[PDB]
Each structure stands twice: as structure tokens, then as C-alpha cells.
């Protein structure tokens, strides 16, 4: 008998991945699969300049909350922790490298509870209104104390990798950038027997590239 | 509110049972397809029709004996301004269909031209046996008669042979619609018709793509194509590409941006032979569509060449043989 931490605290992951520059047989008779889209970043930043439609999508998902559903969630969480009954916000978690790659003028992410994972840095090293944690456990701890809607793992390859291995992800909002770029960090390979796509959106063009959004859901059996 | 959620059940009191659905097909084989909650990728417009035909199609055998599941009247829409609808659930090549398109635009009806370019789309329709069975005993091998090309540039003229120069004979529809789009864009008569009732028996076979109607709004061009007979398993995939490409061409030479491409299907059918393969396909998840780029220097519909077209970022599943016959 047991309840899962990912269902209780509604921890999700959101990302955008382009195709990797594998010049060797990068054309011809190359096999394709969902792992074709795995380029996360290049040299501490994004492989692409600006894909506005992905940003608008990223912002809508990470800032949207349904206040008429919170109490349902509150009860659940308080029940799991064995407890009792401003504007509601979502929580966004990011690795330190992910955080520094953000333009000062956009830190911390507006209308969101910013959480940063780091060992080398501590609260005193930040001026912004953000939470600093040094273990994945502290996030769970923090989540049990805060009033929030949903929790999104904004990323960093390292951050993505460790959250998936621990199966702390309920769903993955994956943006597929249909263009190739130079990358040095990649999204972890998703195990098909653990996560399965359940939704695929319309296809769009933005800043000279097509792209779509898909959703992976954690399987049970 | 939940009162009306009850009225719904009442209004669905006469809907048939899914044993009297029609075709069993066993949709347990569509594990993945039925698991998807939201299927908003445009490729599903095609895939959903294939599912609808397999589940609700009518059983019919043709004049050959081959069997099919058919339905009547479907419509698909693709936003050409957001992508190029080249199916991703199976591998497709476009060199052949583009050459066929240029072949049409030139007004050609000579099958040897395509065969010299190693395009065999019309080979079977141009044989001695095929022509003789069409009662075209006096027709030369590979002389397809007054088909698309001929009708697009010389509708109305008397067809002689594939080597004749029909210059200034018949109506040059292609030219006419390009001019209506440029000068009278709000016109509701911008149509290109290949179905020339008088020339029907003289063609290797009647056109499957009856007509194309254009629409112009705020510098954007949309196209409706009506297909009388549609082989969902093999032809439609290519047909969607052909006309999407064509709309891009017409748009450019008229100084417009490509909007929608609308595909209307009359008799839509699936060959019993393609069923196993179509099942495989429906369980593949689409990849984002690629893009189509035209050499921007081309300004006249007749000046395009094979190297003027580029399909970029085509990600797709493994090739599939709709037949699986050996
Ligand atoms: N396309 C997309 O959707 C995304 C792209 N990216 C790209 O990815 C790159 C960043 O990824 P990557 O280099 O992997 O870095 P991450 O952003 O994952 O940051 C890793 C760092 O976060 C900290 N950290 C991670 N896990 C823990 C933990 N369990 N406890 C304590 N601290 C932890 C550490 O900080 P410290 O070193 O201080 O101890 C660590 O070195 C960038 O180029 C960015 O642009 C990132 C997210 C999304
Ligand atoms: O580009 C093409 C060419 C042919 N067909 C199919 C439709 C029919 O299955 C068959 C022609 O049969 P008739 O409808 O002409 O009888 O070829 C297509 O779907 N697309
Ligand atoms: C390159 O660095 C980042 C990428 C994303 N984006 C995503 N996690 N996902 C997405 N764009 N869909 C978000 C970031 O900071 C808050 C940083």
C-alpha cells in the first residue's frame, strides 16, 4: 500500500529540444525516433536564438493555475503529510547553471515561485526573491510547506536526469523543435516503458522553424 | 452543473451498438492510437479518416475483384503557412510527384518524358495492354491522351497525339486563373477543371483530381481540391503533397502568401490489402511536419524546375509497404 510523491505534489517537467548535429550520416538513410529531439543547450545557453512561440507556450503552462481546484489538491497533500485543512502560483525549479543562463531582467520568473538547486551557492549569494535548496529532498520538504498549484522542473540536463531517474515526474511537456543546432547538453533518453506520449498538439512555424508540443505521461504497467 | 449530462444519454438512445458498429478490425491492435487523449497534429486528419473507414466503411469489390472499404465525403484542411503536410507516419519521396507537376504545367501528355526521368507514376497506364483495354487501339504506347496537362493548357481543343503543338488551341485555364488571382482576387470563378466530359474516353483514365478552386483574402491564397476517387493507403499521401506544393507555386507567382489547402474527398476507400499496414501506421506517433522552400526568383508558373524545390527538416518513420506481399 502506497501513494506516490509525484502524484501528491504534482511535479512536472517542461522542456524544448531540437535535433542534434550528428554530421556523420546526418542525411541519407538515418533512422528517426523520439530521441532525435534531445538538444537542450549549447555553451550555457539555448542552441537557438529565439523561438517566440515556445516562450509563449512555456509561460502559459508554468504560470497557469486553477484556483477552483487547489482545495482538492490541498486536501490531498495535507492528507499525505498527515495534517489537516497572495494569488495562487506555480513553483518552478531550476539548476544553478539553468538559473545563471537567464537574462537578469527576467529573474526571477514573473508570477512564479522560483526555486534553485545548488551546492556551491547559498541564499546569501542571491539578491532575488528565490528559494535555494541543496538536495532533492528539500524540494519535497519545501513543497509540503508552500501553497502552490503545480511544480515544474524547468531544467538543466543534470536536473532533468536526476528527477526522471527518481520517477518524480508525473508528466513531461516536451517541445519538439524541428531544426538542427549545435549542442553540448542533451535531454536524458526517455525510457519508453516508463513514459508514454498521450497528446500531440497542432504543428506551428515560429522564427523559421516548425515545432509542436507533446505530453508524456508516467506509465503504471 | 450536471443535469444536462443526463439529457445527453437520452439523445443517444438510438445510436447503434459497437458490435453492430460494422467492421471488427479488433482496435486492440490500435493500442497507442486509442490511448492518445488529444490528437491535434494535422496528420490525424488523415489518420482519423483511415480509422473511420476501417471501423465504418462499406465492403465493396471493384470491377477487378479487389476488395475495399469505402465511405463518401470527407474534408481535410492544412495550414500551409504553418508547415508542409508531408506525412511522417511513413516515408515519402517527392521527386516523382514534383516532376509530374512540372510535366502537367508544361501541358505534356507524353509518358516517355517521365520515364526518362525514372518516374514511373504513369507507366502502367500507358501500356499497349492498358490502352487496348481502354479501347484506345489507335493510341501510341505511353501517349496518355488528353489528361491533366492537356486540359490545363488546352481544354476544348481536339486532341491528336502527344507530339502535337496545340499552341493557341483550347482554353489555357492555368494562365486564366493566374490572371484572375492577380487582377480580380475576389472572384468566385477561379477554378481549374481537369474533368473534360468530352475527352473522358480518350484519356488513359479519367482524372482522379477533378478541380481546384482558389480563394484570396488579405494577400493570402487558399486552395480547395476535389477528389472523386481516393486510395487512402497509397494515393492520398502523395495527393496532399502535390496540391500543397502547387498552391505554393501559384501563390508565389501571384505575389501572395500560402494559406490553406483544402482536400475534399468524394469516394474514399481503403484496399483490404492495405489494412495490416494501415494498422501499423495508425499506431505511430506523428513528428512535426517539415517545411517547403521555393526558389524565390521564379516569377512565372512555367519557369520552375526540379531544383527549385527544397523539403527541409523532414523527420519521419520507417518506410512502409501497404501491400506486404512477396
Ligand atoms: N531547452 C530546454 O528546455 C532547456 C535547456 N537548458 C540548457 O541546459 C544547460 C543547463 O544544464 P546543465 O549544465 O545540466 O545544468 P543544470 O541547469 O542542471 O544545473 C546543474 C547545477 O544545478 C545544481 N544541482 C543539480 N542537481 C542538484 C542537487 N541534487 N543538489 C544540489 N544542487 C544540484 C548544481 O549547482 P552547483 O554547481 O552550484 O552545486 C549543478 O552543478 C544550459 O545550457 C541551459 O541553457 C536547461 C533547461 C531547459
Ligand atoms: O494520384 C492518385 C491516382 C490514383 N488514385 C487511385 C484512386 C482509385 O483507387 C484508382 C483509380 O480508379 P478509378 O476511380 O478511376 O476507377 O486510383 C489515388 O488515390 N491517387
Ligand atoms: C535555456 O534555458 C532555459 C530553458 C527554459 N525552457 C524550458 N524549460 N522549456 C521550454 N522552453 N519549453 C527555461 C529556462 O528558465 C526559466 C531556461
Write a structural description.
The complex is a heterodimer of chains A (221) and B (326). Chain A has 221 residues and is α/β, with parallel strands linked by helices. Chain A has helices at 5-8, 52-63, 67-80, 96-100, 136-145, 157-165, and strands at 11-20, 37-41, 90-95, 112-117, 131-133, 151-155, 171-181, 185-186, 195-200, 204-206, 209-218. Chain A has one domain: Dihydrofolate Reductase, subunit A (3-Layer(aba) Sandwich). Chain A contains 6 helices and 11 strands. In chain A, helix 4 links the parallel strand 3 and strand 4. The longest helix of chain A is centred in the first third of the chain and has 14 residues, at 67-80. Chain A is globular and about 60 Å long. Chain A starts with a helix and ends with a strand. Chain B is an alpha+beta fold and 326 residues long. Chain B has a single domain, classed as 2-Layer Sandwich (Thymidylate Synthase, Chain A). Chain B has helices at residues 4-11, 31-35, 43-56, 95-105, 111-116, 128-133, 148-154, 173-183, 235-253, 275-282; strands at 38-39, 58-61, 67-79, 191-193, 209-217, 220-231, 257-271, 291-294, 309-312. In chain B, helix 9 links the parallel strand 6 and strand 7. The longest helix of chain B has 19 residues, at 235-253. The site of 2'-deoxyuridine 5'-monophosphate has 10 residues of chain B, from strand 6 and helix 9.
Amino acid at each position: 500500500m502506497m501513494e506516490q510523491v509525484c502524484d501528491v505534489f504534482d511535479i512536472y517537467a517542461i522542456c524544448a529540444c531540437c535535433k542534434v548535429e550528428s554530421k556523420n550520416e546526418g542525411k541519407k538513410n538515418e533512422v528517426f525516433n523520439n530521441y532525435t529531439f534531445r538538444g537542450l543547450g549549447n555553451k550555457g545557453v539555448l542552441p537557438w536564438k529565439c523561438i517566440s512561440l515556445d516562450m509563449k507556450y512555456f509561460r502559459a503552462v508554468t504560470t497557469y493555475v486553477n484556483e477552483s481546484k487547489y482545495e482538492k489538491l490541498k486536501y490531498k497533500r495535507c492528507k499525505y503529510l498527515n495534517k489537516e485543512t497572495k494569488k495562487l502560483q506555480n513553483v518552478v525549479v531550476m539548476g544553478r547553471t539553468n538559473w545563471e543562463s537567464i537574462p537578469k531582467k527576467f529573474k526571477p520568473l514573473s508570477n512564479r515561485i522560483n526555486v534553485i538547486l545548488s551546492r556551491t551557492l547559498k541564499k546569501e549569494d542571491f539578491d532575488e526573491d528565490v528559494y535555494i535548496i541543496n538536495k532533492v529532498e528539500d524540494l519535497i520538504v519545501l513543497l509540503g510547506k508552500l501553497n502552490y498549484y503545480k511544480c515544474f522542473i524547468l531544467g538543466g540536463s543534470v536536473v532533468y536526469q536526476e528527477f526522471l531517474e527518481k520517477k518524480l515526474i508525473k508528466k513531461i511537456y516536451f517541445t519538439r523543435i524541428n531544426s538542427t543546432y549545435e549542442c553540448d547538453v542533451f535531454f536524458p533518453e526517455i525510457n519508453e516503458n516508463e513514459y508514454q506520449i498521450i497528446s500531440v498538439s497542432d504543428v506551428y512555424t515560429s522564427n523559421n522553424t516548425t515545432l509542436d508540443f507533446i505530453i508524456y505521461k508516467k506509465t503504471n504497467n | 452543473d450536471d443535469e444536462e449530462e443526463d439529457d445527453f444519454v437520452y439523445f443517444n438512445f438510438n445510436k447503434e451498438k459497437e458490435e453492430k458498429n460494422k467492421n471488427s478490425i479488433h482496435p486492440n491492435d490500435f493500442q497507442i492510437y486509442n490511448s492518445l487523449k488529444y490528437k491535434y497534429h494535422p496528420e490525424y486528419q488523415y489518420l482519423n479518416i483511415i480509422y473511420d473507414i476501417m471501423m465504418n466503411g462499406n465492403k465493396q469489390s471493384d470491377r477487378t475483384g479487389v476488395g475495399v472499404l469505402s465511405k463518401f465525403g470527407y474534408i481535410m484542411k492544412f495550414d500551409l503557412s504553418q508547415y508542409f503536410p508531408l506525412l511522417t507516419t511513413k516515408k515519402l519521396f517527392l521527386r516523382g510527384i514534383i516532376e509530374e507537376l512540372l510535366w502537367f504545367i508544361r501541358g505534356e501528355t507524353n509518358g516517355n518524358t517521365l520515364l526518362n526521368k525514372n518516374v514511373r507514376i504513369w507507366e502502367a497506364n500507358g501500356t499497349r495492354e492498358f490502352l487496348d483495354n481502354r479501347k484506345l487501339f489507335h493510341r501510341e504506347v505511353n501517349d496518355l491522351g488528353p489528361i491533366y496537362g492537356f486540359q490545363w493548357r488546352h481544354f476544348g481543343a481536339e486532341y491528336t497525339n502527344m507530339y502535337d503543338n496545340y499552341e493557341n488551341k483550347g482554353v489555357d485555364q492555368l494562365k486564366n486563373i493566374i490572371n484572375l488571382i492577380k487582377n480580380d482576387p475576389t472572384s468566385r470563378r477561379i477554378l481549374l477543371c481537369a474533368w473534360n466530359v468530352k475527352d473522358l474516353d480518350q484519356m488513359a483514365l479519367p482524372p482522379c483530381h477533378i478541380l481546384c478552386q482558389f480563394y484570396v483574402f488579405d494577400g493570402k491564397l487558399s486552395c480547395i481540391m476535389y477528389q472523386r476517387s481516393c486510395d487512402l493507403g497509397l494515393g492520398v499521401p502523395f495527393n496532399i503533397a502535390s496540391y500543397s506544393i502547387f498552391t505554393h507555386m501559384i501563390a508565389q507567382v501571384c505575389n501572395l502568401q500560402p494559406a490553406q489547402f483544402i482536400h475534399v474527398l468524394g469516394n474514399a476507400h481503403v484496399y483490404n490489402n492495405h489494412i495490416d499496414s494501415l494498422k501499423i501506421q495508425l499506431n505511430r506517433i506523428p513528428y512535426p511536419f517539415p517545411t517547403l522552400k521555393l526558389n524565390p526568383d521564379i516569377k512565372n508558373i512555367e519557369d520552375f524546375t526540379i531544383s527549385d524545390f527544397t523539403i527541409q527538416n523532414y523527420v519521419h518513420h520507417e518506410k512502409i509497404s501497404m501491400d506486404m506481399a512477396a
